[PDB]
Amino acid sequence: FVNQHLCGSHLVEALYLVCGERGFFYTPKA
Amino acid sequence: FVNQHLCGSHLVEALYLVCGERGFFYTPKA
Amino acid sequence: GIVEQCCASVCSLYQLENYCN
Amino acid sequence: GIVEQCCASVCSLYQLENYCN
């Protein structure tokens, strides 16, 4: 599900699913 | 929409909506 | 932490914005 | 950045995991 264009809340959801317990950081200007 | 129990993907979505361009960091073990 | 403050307990805009960049 | 690598272009698992903690 990861090898596509992932924009906006879709990208954030993918990070959530992939990173799991670790959590993640979302920075759209860097 | 922010003054409730926000768990899992719901919490991540709220951070996305509230933080906007700034982005955010999601750390569920700290 | 964000889960204890916003999932296990009721969230707030103050709490959420502490995690914006 | 994550938007240029995964929204403007096709994402990858390698790219995504670079943003896990």
Swiss-Prot record, chains C, D:
Disulfide bonds: 6-11
TM regions (residue ranges): none
Name by which UniProt lists this protein: Insulin A chain
Species in which this protein is naturally found: Bos taurus
Origin organism lineage: Eukaryota, Metazoa, Chordata, Craniata, Vertebrata
